[PDB]
């Protein structure tokens, strides 16, 4: 039969009022001898009826990908409201049911530290401005760099790692041309998480 994958909305979308967050429900392996797919949705048991369905698309491997999408309320999501997506298909012995939610557990506030590049790394053409984000829960997080209001894209962030005290931590490496840094240009590490005052915090560094 067909299988069902239920995805959370994007952190940035649930953390920014200015953005609209949505839970996706994807059904893959939909058969041609029964592409008809019913969808039922439940926020905390309570059924809801505003889930648009996105263009049906052919995968070219034999099957259809049927996707229904449900806008959530920033508020509802952060609070921890289980979403059930229920998927029926003629070619299918009984409805499948998947549920997803804000990772259970006491939101912790991430501490943010800009670590400067090592004395012993200035003989290279590019130094490493480090950002430490320790002690946060749940691991859903965003993290970007910037300078003079301008974004810095030449960086790479580790995945989040589980720490000793049941929280997560992560490091983001921003790479800049020695010169620029030495100049004194100031660089800022923006962290975005559900547990921050206003979700947003911006630790910077220079000299």
């Amino acid at each position: 039969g067909p299988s069902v994958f239920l995805f959370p909305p994007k952190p940035k979308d649930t953390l920014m009022i200015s953005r609209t967050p949505e839970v996706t429900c994807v059904v893959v392996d939909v058969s041609h001898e029964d592409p008809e797919v019913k969808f039922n949705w439940y926020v905390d048991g309570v059924e809801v009826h505003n889930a648009k369905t996105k263009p049906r698309e052919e995968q070219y491997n034999s099957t259809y990908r049927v996707v229904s999408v449900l806008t959530v309320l920033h508020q509802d999501w952060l609070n921890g409201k289980e979403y059930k997506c229920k998927v029926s298909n003629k070619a299918l012995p009984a409805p499948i049911e998947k549920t997803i939610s804000k990772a259970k557990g006491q939101p912790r506030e991430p501490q943010v530290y800009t670590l400067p590049p090592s004395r012993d790394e200035l003989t290279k053409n590019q130094v490493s401005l480090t950002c430490l984000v320790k002690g946060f829960y749940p691991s859903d997080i965003a993290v970007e760099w910037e300078s003079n209001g301008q974004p810095e894209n030449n960086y790479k962030t580790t995945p989040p790692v589980l720490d000793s005290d049941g929280s997560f931590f992560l490091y983001s490496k921003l790479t800049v041309d020695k010169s620029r840094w030495q100049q004194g240009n100031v660089f800022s590490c923006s962290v975005m998480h559900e547990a921050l005052h206003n979700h947003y915090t911006q630790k910077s560094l220079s000299l």
Binding site: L15, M16, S190, M192, H197, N198, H199, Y200
Partner: peptide, 15 residues
């Protein structure tokens, strides 16, 4: 008032 922004986009406001 008491808000966060990020590259022009409004983030949030607790207040």
């Amino acid at each position: 008032x008491d808000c966060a922004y990020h590259r022009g986009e409004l983030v949030w406001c607790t207040x």
